[PDB]
């Protein structure tokens, strides 16, 4: 079935010390998160660039890593119930906070952790190029050759278009109907590896280190080994849900060329352009498209999705 | 069904500013072109070199990009009816002319835009290496394993042999029969990714910036933001059709080695050489073979072709 | 009287080896050509650049020799009858083919040899700056001061505007009348050294190395010392004549500045601009203006012209 | 059916001028060779190294190209009848000799051209990585999935083990029986792309430039544009057949590691070692194993082989 998604967002200095901490601390946080039985996996991204839309964002390009002074991370964790995410944080607060806080020296902004429900998903399991022979054989043995997925390679061997949208109040249903129609046609593009639509349902105060006064002081004064009071979070997840309603349209691609022209299909193919125009008419903000590299992931989240 | 093809040809300085403008302005032109419902896609090429034919063109080689001071572009746009191309230009002239004119500072020759009909086509849909598992599965589920195409990868990951021919008046039928027979045998060469024969039917004056006196002066005097009179084009598309009749034989290949020895099959394989000799006996000019890289493309034109 | 003109066109690598062969092989070809009594001279050009028309071809300039990776040659041979050119080639094929073929290692495109009739000529004999005293004296002694020409210096000491045009079918007479009126007024421009209008009447297959299948294979397989079958040309000169009709407007100038502002007189001088507008209204293609340096020439062709 | 094989052998200076002539002159010779209807294709190799057999040839390695002062070529041409090869050489002698003689400046040894019959062949058609989807689809449509070959990529994208053997007189039958059993088992090794056994039936004197006294002087005295008398060869092909009987065991591999450990299977796998020991007991000379790169080839010879 469809899990809920927590996306931890932060911006850090673009320097080797940051990427060393990704390799040291990242796996630990993931291991702590996996203590909860509602955890069904994760997909962690670094932003490598921005889709320029021709020259609409003419200072951007799809790979800005060599030039950029910062790196933005977007860490998806998937949950059977979004309340599992909140329980996990509280049950493991002593490990989690101390781990996360060790990133402090590299932080420029964040963490900010909105929660989403998945309202549409066409996402395959990941496979390495070594796996497809056995996948094909199993599917033909089962009499289901239609179930043979594209090869979506894990661990940094594909790219993600992360398309931010916020919708005019009262237009959410028109947006949702038109974006599904759009993605159902978009899957014809070469190198298309899957898509899903995330609809924000709120924000995790504890995952965003957003406390009341007491916890705020505990964070600012912290030597690194004392927890802020997790009961000092002043708001529930739904209380922080944004209006205008926010969505993420998450589309995966074989490479940045397939991304650029594949996403471009909603502008260049007249039939799809007419359908996607109904999306555009609903927007307060967007589409703003970040280019992401899914480097570290627990691919079994897609096994849960498609069961 | 078979679309018509407009091929915009130009020669520009081989320098980074030229390729930057390809990345900034090119997508804009394509987006404007896609406003017309008769537009079914595009395939935009840079010439990377010239087939030397042994040492017949001993100064040429298949990849001259490092040494060449110029870059030739050949931009295919595909149309349900060629008149759609003419209508699109006129309906969107203010955007198109101003976009296109921004390339002027890099231009050495062109634009020149002949219009072609497709008299023969054996062209697959494009697929990325990630896609072939799902394509195979669907074709077997549909009971059509013969319909499984070769893997023709989009966006700069294959090469094109662009073979110019002009034919002795009265020999067009002999040319057309023998070239089809040739291409039906050529598809056995390894790495063959498809072929088509384009027969010129005229030239788009508006796409070639070829006006009467009034438009000529408006082009030469232009600050960049004023349109030449699009009604000042003095000839219709068929009025400029060339005699001797011109053809493009367009053959796609996995790589330049497959191209070199695959096209060479019409000289090296006795059975095919006898067939291709009937092509050669009809020619005023050619074959002259440009090596093209299809870098930017709207691959859905092959979906239209093969429906 | 007016001779016919064959223009051998080719594009070669811009490197010292190419120019060394011009000095070694070029004179030999010309010497073989002078074996025929219908040969009345020659004028051999390298293209040094392209007229930018302001910034219509903003990437071009009048002298591109330092940056360009290729060099284009345009070799005029003049003939009492165009059939003399065809006879000469066949009678001397063993020398000519082997001489021309030794250029192969430098060739990128060509040879392509259209044949032209001269429909208008205002061209003086060449003289060096040392000659003018005797020319002046001789003309006054004869009572013919009007026969004193401008000083048109031979052997690379003037420049040529090579202006390509193709004309809308049915407008040939309007083009020809208007271009003659244009050139009769243009001769007032400072530094004007003469003009002629060449009208294409066909293409020499043998001079273009355009054979049937048999000769094509003999060319491609050639070690350099065996002739392709000269009777294997499959078309006569007039059979290859182009429609739309092609013309060359050939104007000679004291220097590239005189050329730029002198040719510009058809745009800058209102009275001449009105006349030349009648040329522009007839065009399918052009004017496209190559800047040529006449380096090697047999100036006695102008003596034949002016007798 | 099984063609006959001519293998032209030579050793040339290992310098870029040698490889430029391979690209310029090589295709010309092949085009001349394809004039004969008995020609069914070719496979041209450069030796990249020598299999060291541990340190039995401790000064050799599988890739010696960076260090070696020479390059050895082994050019296979395939013929319906070996007499066709002899006929082809004599019928086209003036082109062939002059083309071949242009290699003189680079030659250190050769040419030497033995002729072979194929007594065993397990060789697939070549395919590029782009082709296999259609090959699989076609074979399943034909109901013959067992006929799906390995992917044997043409044009320098695989390697060849060229294993020289000469056999004790009277042991040819034991050798032939044991090598076929060996190769039938060897096809199990990973990356095995095919094998064939060539049995020498003679030597082409004309292809080896081995004339009588008259032709020898004509060769030594040649300016490059005169043929030696091709009828001055003093021996027929079978008159030069070697005793001890010579064989080539030709095995193709995905890469040099597959080659080293795959050919090594006859030493490392006890069951196959016992079978291959019967080959070793018959030998006067060998096995000596050259590592070859098949760079230029006419892949359709395998289409003739497997029909
Ligand atoms: Fe979290
Ligand atoms: Fe166009
Ligand atoms: Fe000529
Ligand atoms: Fe041979």
* Per-residue CA distances from B143 to A146, B152, D133 (Å): 11, 22, 15
Question: Cβ of B189 and D155 within 8 Å?
Answer: no
Within 8 A of B284 by CB-CB distance, chain C residues are 203, 205, 210, 235, 239-240
D305: left (phi over 0), alpha (psi -120 to 50) or beta: alpha
Q: What is the 3-state secondary structure (H, E, C) of A9-69?
A: EEEEECCHHHHHHHHHHHHHHHHHHCCCCCEEEEEEEEEEEECCCCCCCCCCCCCCCCCCC
Nearest Cα residue to A105 out of A174, A170, A20: A20
Q: Which residue of D has its CA nearest to B60?
A: D24
The 3-state DSSP class for residue D22 equals helix
Q: What is the dihedral of CA C96, C99, C103, C104, to 10 degrees?
A: 70
Within 8 A of D141 by CB-CB distance, chain B residues are 145-146
* Per-residue CA distances from C203 to B127, B283, C237 (Å): 44, 12, 5
- Experimental method, per PDB record: X-ray
Which one of the ligands is nearest to A112 CA?
1
- Please give, rounded to a whole number of angstroms, the shortest distance from the CA of B152 to a CA of chain A: 10
Q: Which residues contact D186 (CB under 8 A, 6 or more apart)?
A: D192, D195, D251, D262, D263, D265, D266, D272
- Please give, rounded to a whole number of angstroms, the shortest distance from the CA of C132 to a CA of chain D: 50
Within 8 A of D32 by CB-CB distance, chain C residues are 221
- Please give, rounded to a whole number of angstroms, the shortest distance from the CA of A257 to a CA of chain B: 7
Q: Tell me how far the alpha carbon of residue A6 lies from the centroid of ligand 1, in angstroms.
A: 7
* B and D touching (3 or more beta-carbon pairs closer than 8 Å): yes
Within 8 A of C223 by CB-CB distance, chain D residues are 28, 95, 98-99, 102, 224-225
Within 8 A of D137 by CB-CB distance, chain B residues are 136, 139, 145-148
Q: What is the dihedral of CA B96, B99, B105, B111, to 10 degrees?
A: -30
* Per-residue CA distances from D226 to C77, C227, D86, D218 (Å): 33, 14, 20, 8
* Per-residue CA distances from C96 to A272, B260, C34, C83, C104 (Å): 61, 30, 12, 17, 13
Question: Can you tell me which residue has the tokens 């390339």?
Answer: B103
**What is the CA angle B174-B179-B181, rounded to 5?**
100
Q: Which of A145, A265, A267 sits opposite B137 (nearest CB)?
A: A145
Nearest Cα residue to A75 out of A97, A98, A93, A100: A100
Question: Can you tell me which residue has the tokens 């759009």?
Answer: A182
Question: Can you tell me which residue has the tokens 């080719």?
Answer: C10
* Resolution (Å units): 2.1
* Per-residue CA distances from C139 to B158, C124, C134 (Å): 69, 14, 8
Residues in chain C, total: 307
Question: Can you tell me which residue has the tokens 């572009």?
Answer: B73
Question: Cβ of B126 and A153 within 8 Å?
Answer: no
Q: How many CB pairs under 8 A join B and C?
A: 141
Question: Cβ of B280 and C213 within 8 Å?
Answer: yes
Which residues in chain C precede a discontinuity of more than 2.5 Å between C and N?
none
Within 8 A of D128 by CB-CB distance, chain B residues are 190-191, 254-255, 258
Q: Tell me how far the alpha carbon of residue A101 lies from the centroid of ligand 1, in angstroms.
A: 13
Q: Element (H or E) spanning C245, and its range? A: strand C245-253
Interface test with D, best of B128, B137, B148 (most D CBs within 10 A): B148
Neighbouring CB atoms inside 10 A of D67's CB total: 9
Nearest Cα residue to B77 out of B24, B26, B151: B26
Q: Which of D25, D30, D134 sits opposite B148 (nearest CB)?
A: D134
Say how far apart CA C175 and CA C190 lie, in whole Å: 25
Within 8 A of A268 by CB-CB distance, chain B residues are 30-31, 34, 41-42, 298
Say how far apart CA D130 and CA B191 lie, in whole Å: 6
Say how far apart CA A73 and CA A8 lie, in whole Å: 8
Rounded CA Rg of chain C: 20
Q: Flag whether D85 is marked binding.
A: yes
Q: Which residues pair with A71 in a beta bridge?
A: A12
* B and C touching (3 or more beta-carbon pairs closer than 8 Å): yes
Q: Which residue of B has its CA nearest to D125?
A: B190
Question: Cβ of C221 and D95 within 8 Å?
Answer: yes
Q: Tell me how far the alpha carbon of residue C43 lies from the centroid of ligand 2, in angstroms.
A: 39
Rounded CA Rg of chain B: 20
Neighbors of chain B by Cβ distance (3+ pairs < 8 Å): A, C, D
Interface test with C, best of B72, B174, B204, B216 (most C CBs within 10 A): B216
Whether the CB-CB separation of B199 and B119 falls below 8 Å is answered with yes
Question: Cβ of D225 and C223 within 8 Å?
Answer: yes
Output the six-digit token pair for D145: 């999935």
Neighbors of chain D by Cβ distance (3+ pairs < 8 Å): B, C
Taking the mean position of all CA atoms in its chain, how far away is CA B108?
A: 20
* Per-residue CA distances from B140 to A147, B135, C122, D140, D193 (Å): 11, 9, 75, 9, 27
Q: Tell me how far the alpha carbon of residue D224 lies from the centroid of ligand 1, in angstroms.
A: 80
Q: Which of B190, B261, B269 sits opposite D34 (nearest CB)?
A: B269
Q: Which residues contact B126 (CB under 8 A, 6 or more apart)?
A: A190, B152, B153, B154, B297, B299, B302
Within 8 A of B28 by CB-CB distance, chain A residues are 54-55
Say how far apart CA B113 and CA C56 lie, in whole Å: 17
Which one of the ligands is nearest to A115 CA?
1
The 3-state DSSP class for residue B94 equals helix
Question: Cβ of B59 and C107 within 8 Å?
Answer: yes
Question: Cβ of A258 and B155 within 8 Å?
Answer: yes
B181: left (phi over 0), alpha (psi -120 to 50) or beta: alpha
Output the six-digit token pair for B57: 């063109």
Q: Which residues contact B194 (CB under 8 A, 6 or more apart)?
A: B122, B123, B124, B150, B152, B251, B252
- Please give, rounded to a whole number of angstroms, the shortest distance from the CA of A277 to a CA of chain B: 12
Q: Tell me how far the alpha carbon of residue A89 lies from the centroid of ligand 1, in angstroms.
A: 7
Which one of the ligands is nearest to B207 CA?
2
Q: Which residue of B has its CA nearest to D24?
A: B54
Within 8 A of D134 by CB-CB distance, chain B residues are 148-150
Q: Which residues pair with C45 in a beta bridge?
A: C74, C294
Say how far apart CA B147 and CA A191 lie, in whole Å: 20
Q: What is the 3-state secondary structure (H, E, C) of chain A?
A: CCCEEEEEEEEEECCHHHHHHHHHHHHHHHHHHCCCCCEEEEEEEEEEEECCCCCCCCCCCCCCCCCCCEEEEEEEEEECCHHHHHHHHHHCHHHHHHHHHCCHHHEEEEEECEEEEEEEEECCCCCCCCCHHHHHHHHHHCCCHHHCCCCCCCCCCCEEEEEEEEECCCCHHHHHHHHHHHHHHHCCCCCEEEEEEEEEEEECCCCCCCCCHHHHHHHHCCCCCCCCCHHHCCCCCHHHCCCCEEEEEEEEECCHHHHHHHHCHHHHCHHHHHHHHHHHCCEEEEEEEEEEEEEEEECHHHHHHCC
Question: Cβ of B243 and C243 within 8 Å?
Answer: yes
Nearest Cα residue to D257 out of D74, D72, D66, D63: D63
- Please give, rounded to a whole number of angstroms, the shortest distance from the CA of D261 to a CA of chain B: 28
Q: How many CB pairs under 8 A join A and B?
A: 98
Q: Which residues contact B157 (CB under 8 A, 6 or more apart)?
A: none
Q: Which residue of A has its CA nearest to B157?
A: A257
Peptide bond into D274 cis (omega under 30): no
Within 8 A of C9 by CB-CB distance, chain B residues are none
Residue ranges of the alpha helices (H) in C193-241? 213-220
Say how far apart CA A288 and CA B2 lie, in whole Å: 37
* A and C touching (3 or more beta-carbon pairs closer than 8 Å): no
Say how far apart CA B232 and CA B234 lie, in whole Å: 6
Question: Cβ of C244 and B244 within 8 Å?
Answer: no
Q: Which residues contact C270 (CB under 8 A, 6 or more apart)?
A: none
Question: Cβ of C220 and B70 within 8 Å?
Answer: no
Say how far apart CA A148 and CA A136 lie, in whole Å: 6
The angle, 0 to 180 degrees and rounded to 10, between the axes of the packed helices C270-280 and B213-220 is: 120
């Amino acid at each position: 079935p469809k899990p809920y998604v927590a996306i931890n967002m932060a911006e850090l200095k673009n320097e080797p010390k940051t990427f060393e901490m990704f390799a040291s601390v990242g796996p630990k946080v993931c291991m702590v998160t996996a203590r909860h039985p509602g955890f069904v996996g994760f997909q962690n991204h670094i932003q490598i660039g921005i889709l320029p839309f021709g020259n609409r964002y003419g200072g951007a390009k799809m790979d800005m890593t060599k030039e950029s002074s910062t790196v933005r991370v977007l860490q998806y964790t998937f949950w059977k119930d979004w309340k599992d995410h909140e329980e996990m944080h509280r049950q493991n607060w002593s490990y989690l906070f101390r781990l996360c806080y060790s990133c402090a020296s590299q932080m420029i902004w964040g963490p900010w952790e909105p929660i989403y429900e998945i309202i549409y998903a066409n996402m395959p399991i990941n496979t390495e190029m070594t796996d497809f022979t056995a996948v094909v054989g199993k599917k033909f043995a089962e009499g289901k050759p239609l179930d043979i997925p594209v090869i979506s390679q894990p661990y940094g061997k594909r790219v993600v278009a992360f398309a931010e949208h916020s919708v005019i109040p009262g237009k959410e249903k028109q947006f949702e109907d038109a974006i599904v129609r759009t993605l159902e046609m978009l899957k014809k593009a070469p190198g298309f590896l899957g898509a899903m639509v995330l609809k924000e349902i709120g924000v995790s105060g504890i995952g965003s280190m957003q406390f009341g006064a007491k916890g705020f002081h505990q964070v600012l004064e912290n030597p690194g080994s004392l927890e802020p009071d997790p009961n000092n979070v002043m708001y529930s997840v739904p209380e922080a849900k944004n209006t205008p309603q926010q969505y993420i349209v998450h589309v995966e691609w074989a490479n940045t060329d397939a991304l650029m022209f594949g996403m471009g299909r909603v502008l260049l193919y007249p039939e799809l352009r007419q359908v996607h125009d109904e999306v555009l008419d609903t927007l307060v903000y967007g589409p703003y498209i970040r280019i992401l590299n899914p480097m570290m992931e627990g691919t079994f989240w897609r096994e849960y999705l498609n069961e």
